[model samples]
Target chain A: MSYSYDAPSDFINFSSKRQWALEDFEIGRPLGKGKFGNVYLAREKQSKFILALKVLFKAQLEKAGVEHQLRREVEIQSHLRHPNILRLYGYFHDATRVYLILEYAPLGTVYRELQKLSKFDEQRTATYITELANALSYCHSKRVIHRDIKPENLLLGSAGELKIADFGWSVHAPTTLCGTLDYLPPEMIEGRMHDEKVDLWSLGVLCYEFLVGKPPFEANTYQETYKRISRVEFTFPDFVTEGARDLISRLLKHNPSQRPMLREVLEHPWITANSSK
Target chain B: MSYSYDAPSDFINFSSKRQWALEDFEIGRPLGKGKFGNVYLAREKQSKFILALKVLFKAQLEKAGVEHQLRREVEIQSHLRHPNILRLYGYFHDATRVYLILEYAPLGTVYRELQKLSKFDEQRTATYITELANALSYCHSKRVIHRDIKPENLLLGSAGELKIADFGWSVHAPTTLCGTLDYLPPEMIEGRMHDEKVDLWSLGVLCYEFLVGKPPFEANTYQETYKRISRVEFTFPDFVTEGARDLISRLLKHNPSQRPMLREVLEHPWITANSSK
Candidate 1:
């Protein structure tokens, strides 16, 4: 998981508080298009360093009423300097939109890769989980919980290592029930107050989804999925090994607080044994 | 655990940064004397509010080289406000001794109470555990870690509810491995960097002690006890119930990071069932 992205000296320079403009970056190609904006593969014209420029439409953000949340995400992520977490270099705004300068993940989003690959093998899955556990723990240490932690919110680094992206739902401790439905813990679904432990449950759900093609509680009806989640009802497929099961069992405890801490997840036999691969 | 201690207005006024002196309080009979100081039951002369005023010898503290830790304890404990946590109102120093104004627990040190009772019944033990959990959780929220958590460090309040006293070894976040021998966790024993989860291990040890009148890791020789703790070696008495064992098991996980969270302890079947009694 060792990555050495060249530090940006002139463009994407965090040392200087100098304001950036659209001219600072040479927008190469559209990386992805989402609800609010388009992410582009951009190269800083001065330092000539590669970065992902996320151009979010002001109108769309205002209409969605997530301008405040976007700021929160920027503040939290920009300060986080972990190898496993995607670096948010800095941000700037224009007449109609905000441009976020982010570390370029050469391999792109994990969600798209998972879709193409269908299911990941043991080594890759374990490595991703291990990387995520490290990144998630750093967030927890900073009093920030990445409430939204799914394949969609992750990316692959230059070395195919996991990088936690998207801090839209992060907060400094308390929770208010806003995460992807399938990955939501029982406490969150019940609308009970949640803490950092919710991320543990999400990690479990993500691990299961990583090993198997679909989430454990995936069903036709919304009611069925809800009931299954409430009951913590999930079964392993034939391909899932005992080691993986043991790890997931620790992570997916019915009570959110009972879920194993991320450090334990990192030290789990499954993670320790397969993560090196 | 609902307590209604009358707030002070004049003598122990926190609003005014006015320095206090010996004349401000009317000293009475002594409470249990400890390593660094003697705690006297004192009433504020003006407000007439009862408090446990501890007088510490500055010479002894200087010789012992814990004056820095003393200030750390005061700063950490003074700001923490919880029903289960003993309140540290203010402090004053004279020529040779420093005084600490703390909440008065009429029943005094829990170690004496435990000795008198021999062993606590299920209800009392569960109640103490629950109270300690709440207090510890609050301390954790304030980033305060009570490295030393045991019967000796606890006090029974006016109404017989548990009160967390003595923040002598308390610190904000970080740790340096200084707790009662029997209560020390494996991480500390191994000289590894520890977190607040050390308190979880202590709580487990305390619960066992409360029920059985002895810490589980008790041994005659130093080597034996150290080895026992390092290995997490302990056996419950026959009187220990299945539910209680279950609760302790969750708390006493070998890896500190794997210990069940305090909230989980609060919601555990044993605590939920017996705590009400």
Candidate 2:
């Protein structure tokens, strides 16, 4: 399996992207065991639901003792409401692993789809971008900030709608710094306290990625990434929509306060009031 | 029912302690509804385990919308590990409310207990003090400071062990002035950037509260609380043990750096090798 979502697969390629492929999911087969604990490639045994059962090993958790983080992930995912957000079907723990039976996105993540398709159409991008905005708005209202928003973390359900997943880095901070480097805002680079405004910055980066088919500030090294981020320099290609450039520029604002609020962004002439038809 | 913690029967009779308890918890039950949320007693559905549900009301949260602070709470709580820290059973939410099922302490908070019991035996006090040191040590390791470590937030489980319950007053600052009056260290009161040493000062105030059966400095009014806290005048009770007095004096040292570290506090003769025995 390769880490890159874009790896071409004429043959079986074992990657994190397609770990939950249809072939591996045996019909009627319950999730089995792993080092992490019990993993069930859940088959309805009738309709064959075909979802991966990643059970959190309680003994290992007790031994390593991650009761707190485990609790946090569970707590955070519960409040979040979005079609793109993974549906948490509650949890189960017998003696060993805590079961997190989640909805399986057969097509895998957004990055994988983008890599396979090479890029997304404006309408397809708009549909996903709108859903993300709504979901993120709901999350922000609940004070849940998805700190590490990235292409790899966004997934496509069986229906082809974009959903935000992997909320391990999601934080409920109201006035602190958070987020990954590629997706982070200028304020985070400046070491300033942030709020939901940071999410808008990430959203901007996501928009840029969707349009350009790459991270806005990609570099070979961490130092290079830092220097580019510090400079807060990036040029949207001419092929990218002028409307998108205007929206992305507003989102990449250095000050958190200056960054467009999610609601405001949804209302942005580029996203909400656009007449691209 | 009222939305409050009904102080104690003994404190009520004498009118010595301030009212801390609510007569009616069965009414709205605080929705477990703020960032720190409310520590609530709830009637569980056919379960023997009595629940102290920390309720987070979605509506109010959406209104206040301090996402960054919530993120910090999640992050700090996720990383923190210690017996004295409160246990979170994770969160569940609907459109209306978010419930954080926590370990319920029937004995209620420490301030209330102290008010009723007046003063605890030196040995018992020593045990609690040591537990607090360990807890603070754990928090400091994670770069977290319990900005509020006053008696009101210190809960006693069914086992009679003390647990720090509220993170609303916590701050994950590199060095920033925060916390409440009387508990805030002098430097913090003066708007100085303080480290984990601020917790030591708060702990010192708690020690004084234990020995004297009241905070070292108190007034009939809230402003007086501010005045005395700013002064940081730590007074010793006549009956306080010499060992305790020495330790309190050290912890209440005017300089934050000068305040005793957790290891030093543990090493103090009053709390050293024979302390637990």
Candidate 3:
């Protein structure tokens, strides 16, 4: 399906509203940045609870035609509560600004820290994988589908619990054509109806990235990345452990039916018997 | 200069303001984290001016006894307009919250990007070096000292200009006991009254990081990182040209004055003759 085009019922009026500023917040230093906005560590003066503040503008949202979805994402995040989900605190607006306050995970994003550390051990990998599974399962149970499930979105929260974040591309499940090509299942690549199984396929790719540094079939450009995905073609390296390799091979199967279901994935002998803390 | 503690007598009061959030801001996905506040990329709904919104809480600022310094940084950034500096719009506050509207750079910290690309070539390195020197020159001319001058604070703006950000640690020139230890010059390390020369020294070290994959002096702990700095010892690999090596040695001199002054640094034979971009 084409992306949504409706702007929000109301736009953020910048002339009157404003978020807290550097002097106002205890802004320490720089974190990472993205194409659209920068994330910052924030604290509630009264509760002393830490939060991640994402600052963006409303006019661009209207131009992008994803204003409604942006509002929905905030609304969904604010009311939703799950251990594996990064909480959204809701949106604040003023005449000249708009701000999205969110739960701050002390550990930061898994993709970033992992890059600094090189790679993770099997036990560490297993712990995060399972935690992510539980969070994704819960989200799917709620009929919410996280369209993007890359290393960047998988955040390790306080004490190493993986809280999935970045709901920009998410939507309810059972919809078609809603994922990054690399993580897309065969049916999804063909623009057919897919279910929670698609998330399981993404989990497989994530497990691979945890061991290695990239996805299974990465290419330099979007077209190349998509071609590799649509062609349903790739192979595993010998350096990957037999058990892990076997698991990846199964998960990356050309046919969706041939791939292990989520339950089967969790209970695979390689996982149930050998996975970590 | 002693950092100012009192708020600007004419600080704008934004409390009980019926500002429209939707009309002005087009908020997008969460960027990365800041130290104490959340930073979101926002587009002004009217002017379509994009910015990085930094929000801080006043009560927390007061509790931390950082109100004085916070005001000074906001004051400094707002007043200064330099090609190399991140511009700060004026600050606004309600009784409970404080906000600083800032110019947003779509490109993020050069540090994170370096980690991915490993290192930059000689040409690119020279261009960034010259650009940064020009920026820092402006800051020094204004009697502002950017105590923190590391890769994280150097940002790439849309015009590809390298701009300095995160003024939280900045103080007007002549202040001592500021700056991150890693970037601190020998005088600052030895509790000497330092000047803009400290920023020049940092530029040298940052150049080393850009040439190599890591910082010139890095250790597992900050304690270790400091000890090495205090001792004024480190090693460089052969891949670094003799010219580059000479520059690093001169800038890292134990005597702060021995470190080349900013003007002379720009004229150094290594920089003057380099074929770097």
Candidate 4:
């Protein structure tokens, strides 16, 4: 051989001791942020990998005293691995602030696209429903409940893979109800010590929104929205498919126990027949 | 003072149940990365704050078997809150990778500046030494030992605060011999059970390097470097001040017991006199 070099047990040099620094990146544009901080798009100098960076001010965090919540979010999100869920690789911090390195969804978020498209196609709806069904199924298995699930919190990867992007309202079971008004489950509204079923209801709500363009309970007034949600009501658009309407009906169950399991939702003929992959 | 909304319990909306998403941020440039990940600079969409995002590949992490290390790094780093330590705001993940939200350091790592100048002024050296001493003292109190202490692993803030930028090799008091060779302690060289004292030796090496423009134990060959380190053989340049030499001498104790307490290091006349604030 013309050249030779030493190699270890594996060609990939894996070390638990790999350290990180803010300056290691080549620095690029804003991807996403808050009073807490902001998220940006960037690439690592060595690997040329694309990523989203989240920065939070320490003074703001300490002033608000929400560092504990941040800690919990880190623990829950970092351990979860799934196609529909965003991956929290790791984190680092420095003077006056903290930062999160997140996966970059080149396609931005579902909210903007939904706004532009008005309503997603049935096939696209099928893909999102299956993705959430599978993602929520994984979260439930881990006892992690995403208290909020809506187009606003959903992101899209390059190939249109749905990503459950945020964990601000997520927690391990033995849970709480802190979510957007539209996505709130009946159990949450009733404040009845909710569980993963809350997410099932959200999936139903999200499914409807993806298909019909707007929450099932949206009203001109907040009071009416609550009233409609409390009644588990709102009519579907004329174009809404029978399968979608059926799925929505099951998820919008005013009674939490009546909601179908995420697995069952995936197995529902509607999801099976419509899913592209 | 004229306006009022429904106020929260502490007059702040400190919710453990906060949620986040990619589109929530404006996205920006990289701060820093490898085949595994990269970091970036960003601002929050709501707060208009700055942050660094670290992105790592899930497949790469899974392939490398280093996810556990990432978890451990998160646990240790998040628990540590110090002026000289970086903050890990939080993290999220998606289809192919993971991410970490961290604090943004306006100033970059120390290595570049040190390389550009080829040496440091005693005043700057004292500030770094003092800052590191306080930070490391805090780490020891929490039973954390930053096994590696070199310019490359350190960063700076706008006001020149020293930031211990990396924790890949940091661990609880009960530790290992994982660190840059130039900063390695004698006990580490011999593969003996080590503790926080390893950092003392490293501090001494770092101090000497900062003052003299090269590692105290560096040699043309790896064998000579090891030999020099084992024998504790070194000579400071003529320009190195007497006080810095004394502090370095105490920190470079061949016997771990002889190393001075960090309080004493800070109390040393040189550090006290030269410290900016």
Candidate 5:
């Protein structure tokens, strides 16, 4: 079987002129694994543009009942063009698999970088947070909520520039409860309606992990993690800076209305300090 | 007459939620003025997000025969999302003026910053060049050619980050002659047709100005400037470092085919040296 999509004519010029195929790319080693796919480093033969080619198994997608989800993800990702948000140029598919060509992040995943270093200094952490805030601010302003904003979803370019890599669970003004347990907001865990503020809550969790080497709401089991999140229970380690603590406190507020907007987060004293540096 | 657009449902819950009106923004001081518009510092009442609102008179846009040009600029700018590329959130219009709400760069224009500082140090110059190259590389990959890549089009964030703020003279793989004369390349000046390489030539001219405080091909008159550009005649001053001179030479080639791609420019010794820091 073959697959086809009528990409929008505005950006269609991009997809049409560069009609990519399996033959157009020279596949290299595996970059990493997704839930139902594997990402490979590949170089386009003509342009020599290196990209991460994500190959998702059709059987797995069907089995997981996520074909529509994948369609929505592609629709959202391909239309977006941001530096911190990884570029999804175009996609193609064969009988068994779907392929998504994405911008290659040479420095690898932010999670791995954090694991190797244990934790980051205030400067590095603040810089990453600032970039993330800018990116999310852009997303929220567009009405796209990245439900999952964690270290695992972040990639670093060769120059240490941060890129948001995963938007699998993201949606446009979603009312459904979806996201990782550790990073889930109290409103989400309570089966209540949530908005873009859910991302702000996750960002607070990410910032805590950046400073203390672990998520603030972590537990030995998923049930306990959910319980802790529902109760908004987390304590800051002494080593975390006062500025970060202040910002995190503002973001991790129990009431969704009380959470700081991403734009406000970018204006936080800690973020401005790092940004100006 | 009222104008309405069917924004994409995916990322534009934004437009649906806050249907912007001129009354929604509290206008502040004027930032700058262009041929058809004035850019003002404004804050969104609901989100309190500071933005640069460019107000263009509809009569003037139609009279100047730039209505189509304005549409093209908005279409291209709205689709792009990059840290070093200023964000255009969305637009609204009244009977008389079209208002464009854009990301605010608190620090001001790069041209003004450059004039104030006279000439930048090697580190600052290299950093700005690297950022510009990264942004342009992404643009080229997407088939967007920013023909006018000059300091005036560049904006600096409060944190010293560089962003390409104007897309007035950009296109998707343009074939006809375009862009400013001082920064124009040989192919463009000769009316021989051009593509993304035009931006590379402009980048070279921009780099020259960063170090020497003036563009490479400046002359007493437009005729002399055109003559110098046609000949690709620009000599490096003795004060420039060897690495800087080499990179500029590779970029300012007479033949567009010989010019280094923006990605290669990012990898140039001078760029990488400053980037690693």
Candidate 6:
């Protein structure tokens, strides 16, 4: 077939007057589901842009009092232009479903990958953390904080590149307390006004999880997790290298002000050892 | 000063809910102005990243009844991630003005640069066209059609890389006729339902202008210009090389169906001859 001149067979100009619908896509199997939405692997009919279409139910969103939150998530995720952050392309709605066309991560969520691999080696962990740090650095620089930075929120692209996804809990430097309990920083538990430092703490926890196969402060119960987080108590595993331990310790500090900044974490010897390559 | 761990002095996470104000940015002299707003060379206080702050007056935008158009531009530009596409960092607004924080292109618009150089050499032109074709390919892959592909919309980075800077006259797959008159496809003027082929036609005009230092069909009157465009009546200057003429001829075919596709244009012997280095 002539590949050179025929207009792209599946091209669709999203910003035009054309309103998108579920029917415009060739939907595949359901990727997964959340409380208010379900994600499906789909390809746009015209441009053949493969994406993850997240369909949210309006009634469920309104019932959860998270309509405003969903709007903010879309606003923030759509605006974030970074390699390590998943892209939220234009969204459209129907009578029932608000479909968000997202950049597809062929490898799926990092949490699933983590589950398959248990733990990443130091070099891989270093590379992944560095990428997350860069994405976070970019995010924090723009004043948007990704409140949820757990493994579940990270995805692996086709090339095994780590992309931060799931901005549902994200906000513009949120002052109120939010995020997964295990990943929550000390100040957040104390009801202190937090900034980008919360994400730093989560990164620290995330790095620790990469090395230890679990969060730094995971406990038998939610209260125990909260206590361990508030108390800022955690011991590095014997397998944790000195450089990795030092970096984690520096990041997971009791005081947000005292925690090592993302740039510092990125520059740490453990991270740099395998990053230059 | 220690640059590390300083919150990416040049980073701005635009979604952080802290609305940026004129005071937040240290605005320098006006870089340029458009019909809707003025772009100022500015710097964020904390990150120290120099950026182009486009301040669009709300009243002017409202008067133009282009609020939807501006929103579409932001939505499209912010979501696009490519080296050859200008990055729309984020936006903020007050009652009077809406501010778009954009990536500052130090080398300025390609039109100004082209004017400085009169016309580009084959290698220079090939390199730029290769980059532009790659960006256009990426856009087309994502289902976007930059309807207006003129020199004025192209920009140069500090390293002299080509960047598609303007999306004001762009749309996804525009059903309606819109774009610069000089670059509009014959099918568009004929009121035919057009798709990505329109961009290909404009690309042909752009390439002609790049090589010959002027559009192929410049005429004394609009009627003459329109006639020349519709009829595809233009001769290649003697200065144009055999290979360039061949490629331009293929792209500028009066029949949209006959025009070369972007992939073919990229792979054209003329474009690839000097692009391998």
lDDT of 5 by residue, B92-164 (tens): 7888998887889998888898879998877888888888888887887777876656676789887889989
Q: After superposition, how far is residue B212 of candidate 4 from its true place, in Å?
A: 82
**Residue B55, model 2: Cα distance from true site in angstroms:** 16
- Assess every candidate by TM-score: 0.47, 0.49, 0.44, 0.46, 0.46, 0.47
Q: Which stretches of model 1 miss by more than 4 angstroms?
A: A1-17, A174-194, B1-277
Q: Per-residue alpha-carbon lDDT of model 3 for A1-277, expressed as tens digits?
A: 1112121222222224443333334544445564445677776553555677676666665565455456557645655679989987555555544566667778778878788976776667677777777787778777666645667677777687888887764555431112112111121123222245556667777778777766766766655554565555556666667777777777765445566766666766666655663
For all candidates in order, the CA lDDT equals 0.73, 0.60, 0.62, 0.69, 0.71, 0.71
Q: Compute the interface RMSD for each candidate structure.
A: 21.0, 19.0, 25.5, 30.8, 26.2, 28.5
* Candidate 1 CAPRI-style tier: incorrect
lDDT of 4 at B187: 18
* Top-lDDT structure, candidate number: 1
In candidate 5, the residue pairs with backbone N, CA or C atoms under 3 Å apart (3 or more residues apart, or in different chains) clash, namely A81-B81, A82-B81, A142-B11
N/CA/C clash count, model 4: 66
Model 4: per-residue Cα lDDT over B7-125, one tens digit each: 11111111325544565455688666655888778766667777777878878876765664565576578678898999876655667766666778888878888998899988888
Question: Of the candidates shown, which would achieve the greatest DockQ relative to the real structure?
Answer: 2
Error of 3 at B169 (Å): 1.7
- B75-133: candidate 3 lDDT, tens digit per residue: 66877888778877555565565666777878888877798799987667767887778
iRMSD (Å), candidate 6: 28.5
Per-residue lDDT of model 5, residues A1-277, tens digit only: 1133322212123233545678878999998887888999998776777788899998998776566457657766776778899988888887799888888998988889988999988888888888888888888777787766667679999888999966665665521112112111121123222267767777787788888898876777756665667667779887887888998888777666788877788778887886533
Question: Which whole-number lDDT from 0 to 100 does residue B200 have in model 5?
Answer: 78
- Residue-level lDDT for A140 in candidate 2: 81
Question: What is candidate 6's lDDT per residue for A20-46, written digit by digit as tens?
Answer: 667889999899987888899998887
Shift of residue A65 alpha carbon in model 5, Å: 30
**What DockQ does candidate 6 score?**
0.01
lDDT at residue B45 of model 3 (Cα atoms): 65
Clashes of 5: 3
Q: Would you list the rank order by lDDT, best first? A: 1, 5, 6, 4, 3, 2
lDDT of 5: 0.71
